[PDB]
Amino acid sequence: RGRKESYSIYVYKVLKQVHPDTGISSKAMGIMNSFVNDIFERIASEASRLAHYNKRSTITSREVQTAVRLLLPGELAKHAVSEGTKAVTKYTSS
Amino acid sequence: RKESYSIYVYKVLKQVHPDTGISSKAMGIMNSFVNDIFERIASEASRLAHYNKRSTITSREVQTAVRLLLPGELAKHAVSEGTKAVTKYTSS
Amino acid sequence: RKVLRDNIQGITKPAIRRLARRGGVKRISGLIYEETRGVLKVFLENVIRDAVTYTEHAKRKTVTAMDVVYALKRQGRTLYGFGG
Amino acid sequence: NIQGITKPAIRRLARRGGVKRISGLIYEETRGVLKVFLENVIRDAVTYTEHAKRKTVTAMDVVYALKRQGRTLYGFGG
Amino acid sequence: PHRYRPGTVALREIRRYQKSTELLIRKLPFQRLVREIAQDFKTDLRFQSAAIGALQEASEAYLVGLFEDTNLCAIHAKRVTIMPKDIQLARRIRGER
Amino acid sequence: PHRYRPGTVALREIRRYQKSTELLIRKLPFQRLVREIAQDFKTDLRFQSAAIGALQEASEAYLVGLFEDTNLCAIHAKRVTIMPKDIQLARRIRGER
Amino acid sequence: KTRSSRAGLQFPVGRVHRLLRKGNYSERVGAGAPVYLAAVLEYLTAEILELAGNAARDNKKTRIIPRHLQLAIRNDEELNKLLGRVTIAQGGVLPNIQAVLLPK
Amino acid sequence: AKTRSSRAGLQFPVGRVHRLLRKGNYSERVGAGAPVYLAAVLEYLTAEILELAGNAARDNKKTRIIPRHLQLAIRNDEELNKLLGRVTIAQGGVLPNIQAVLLPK
DNA sequence: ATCAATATCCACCTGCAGATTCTACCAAAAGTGTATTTGGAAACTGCTCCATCAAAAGGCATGTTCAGCTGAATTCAGCTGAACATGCCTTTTGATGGAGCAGTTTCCAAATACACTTTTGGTAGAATCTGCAGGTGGATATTGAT
DNA sequence: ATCAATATCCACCTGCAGATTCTACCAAAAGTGTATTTGGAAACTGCTCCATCAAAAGGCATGTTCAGCTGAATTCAGCTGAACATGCCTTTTGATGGAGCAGTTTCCAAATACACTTTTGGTAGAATCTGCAGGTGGATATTGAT
């Protein structure tokens, strides 16, 4: 009523990680939210398509990874594949 | 295995040009066309339903999608044909 | 209310000049201003048309900022900073 | 192999594009552009191939790659 | 009486507006333009203020982009003055027309 | 002792090639180029003939379009000879650069 | 007894419905949506086939080939706008020579 | 009761990303590693942009990141620029850039 | 412009042969009937936020003048790219036969979806804190006339 | 190579608009226990895909010669920039009613889920046809030249 979710707290955390002294105006946070939702939908829909082309009903981290490789360029992709693979194996270590 | 739209394209061809045939490469192009437009309409209707927090794609979504994609024409006539096929369907 | 007419001329010559400057333009032929108005008018028609279509689809009378954001995303002019 | 894309072939492409006169430097510029194009499309295609655990690039892999690049092609699978 | 030579103030304005980010079209005129175009498409419309704001930011971002490409066309013609045929060439290559 | 003036056969070839639809790059050289570029991404690959045909049709359509925009840039500069700066201007306006 | 005949369509309503359910577009699919969508697909198909049959006639041909589809699309303002980022394999281009490049 | 973000070593919300995938009509089923991987990629890209933006803020003697700083961060990094070459950042302006031929002779 | 020659291009008609078309039969969809589920339209209604309106004021828009220098002619010559014919070679074509390998088909164990119960992380306000937007000062370039 | 006019820094000062932090309910993650699959891991076909042969038939590479196009140099009318006077109309602050979003409920028409039956569309060996590609032979288009 009329409660609406955001990524702001998580953006702010990561912000404090990289630049502990620095803040972010709400307009810039607005931009950051648009960015996260945008990239989320690009990754998710490319993954949706990969799964469809291979008659597979499940989006796994393998799909998400191929999508990240198709969308991100170059050096951003190699670092994103690294961080994602690392988080998935850390997660499966219960 | 490997369904196509060839049969239906050929029927429509005989409706507008009973005298005219179509090479298989041209039938390929017609297939690509139908699959393409299909995915544009379906994807826009999907988004339309999501923006309005609805779980059902109805002819209302399909119509607004058609208005959003075809220039209008070709959209006024598409809206005509669609409304017409739906009412002919609902009274049977 | 009151009748709206000729508002494109509210896009003044100094404003078009400023926009040219942010775009790095140094010298502007006298015919640019009426071209720009024409180009702007097409841009607005295409976006507002789509936005208002999203509005009509939701059985609303108020064009929301989300309607404009979706219209821009359809046109391949994705906009950040109003998205939510 | 890029040089196997010969000068007369680039002439023919230009003529279909309505070009009447061609500067001598156009041929190497064209080869560079063609090579960026193929690198971008093939890279994505082979990414689809690898995702499918195959060793054979499909026409469908090329068609999906071309649709990602905004170069949708009719007549080969979609 | 002091006088800057033509082109000097123009370069000053390029430098100035390329540092800033504020909108360059006047708010109320633009709002009237949006309402006129919208009304000639469907009547009884209302607008969230932020919807007008989004339209203005999009529109100004678009026009500034177009003027960069226009400027490139003028320079390609060994000129310095953008002309309508420059905008037309830009919009043609961009696939807008 | 017969010679056509420069430009005459060129117009004749424009009229010919705008009328046909045959691929204008030779198949085998093209196939070598595709397989070579592919080898830097994944090794010992195989290609459906239809995948090679699809790539060639895509590339030839791309280059022909690019030459149309290039020609327009050359005309814009009051020339009739396309040059690399014409291709560069078109590719920039297109957002490929 | 099929839904297409009931809708008066050559195109397959039942298949368009199965592709909408299976295509991950939404949870539920209304009963008229496959009908509507099938009608729109058949109408656009007819429009192109009409114009391409015409190009074929105009070329003393009875069988439509890709080139006739290209001439049909590029010569129609609206089909061209709808397909301005699509390449039709083996379709070629429209005859067009810039005035400045003509003789005399 | 560990959170999945914690298990994954991440700040971004794995559970919420898993819920956005099921509700988003992307596929029938969603494997358990997909939301972890996706939240990881989203958090890394957020980190990369905020890094570059904070640097712009410092270069202009400011402590709070505003949109202009986001614009400079993106337009000055080739890869963020390609990733967002079709995105408009409200109140970001443009990069200072004057074509050489236009400066005094 | 209209004499004469060289090529080009255009029609009409011709006969193969590579693709269409028409004919002949089986699993996977498509239609039906029966029984539940449920999404979201209808019916109020709380309560943002949109459209108007009033008013005072200063930042800007409008118009005008004036001439600096830009764009658009015009000319011209060097040399770049077009048109050739001549030469030789890589592309094309078409099998034969070998094989690497997409596509089936039969799996079972890992992993996903359910489905209630228990927790807690995040959202929407109050409450408490603080970058920085402008405002005014004289350094330090920057331009443009002599 | 020097003033002078004007624009541009850059640092120092300070409370207010906007941010950062503090507090409480609830939607939503998490845990646990069930009951379906999924899509992998093996073992095998039949396609289609390289790898070669081995002719000839193109189509490309090469060097000649020059026509004509690009670019450099010069001019100059007048377009467009800079500066100025004048005063309008956008901004900004703030208030008001009420449209119309949006949040709760209630609850039927229309959706998903089966289970059974029956039809259709894809497949692979049936039977013709449309045009390609060569044949003329007749105008046409180009380009040289009293």
Author numbering:
A (entry chain D): 31 to 124
B (entry chain H): 33 to 124
C (entry chain F): 19 to 102
D (entry chain B): 25 to 102
E (entry chain E), F (entry chain A): 38 to 134
G (entry chain G): 15 to 118
H (entry chain C): 14 to 118
Pull text from the paper.
Chromatin, composed of genomic DNA and histone octamers, dynamically changes its structure to achieve correct gene regulation, replication, and repair of genomic DNA. The recent advances in understanding chromatin structure have unveiled the diversity of histone proteins, the so-called histone variants, which play specific roles in specialized local chromatin structures. Thirteen of these variants share functional amino acid motifs with H3.3 and are suggested to be subsidiary variants (sub-variants) of H3.3. H3.3 and H3mm7 differ in their amino acid sequences only at T32I and S57A; however, it is not clear how this small difference in the amino acid composition of H3 results in a marked difference in function of the nucleosome.
The diversified function of H3.3 has also been studied in active transcribed gene loci during cell differentiation or development, as well as in the centromere. H3.3 is incorporated into skeletal muscle gene promoters prior to differentiation. The overall structure of the H3mm7 nucleosome is quite similar to that of the H3.3 nucleosome. In the H3.3 nucleosome, the S57 residue forms a hydrogen bond with the R40 residue of the cognate H4 molecule. The dissociation of nucleosomes was observed for both H3mm7 and H3.3S57A under conditions of 600 mM NaCl, but this dissociation was not observed in nucleosomes with H3.3 and H3.3T32I. We found that the H2A–H2B dimer became dissociated at lower temperatures (60–70 °C) in nucleosomes containing H3mm7 and the H3.3S57A mutant compared with those containing H3.3 and the H3.3T32I mutant. After photobleaching, the fluorescence intensity of GFP-H3.3 and GFP-H3.3T32I dropped to ~10% of the original intensity and recovered to ~20% in 240 min.
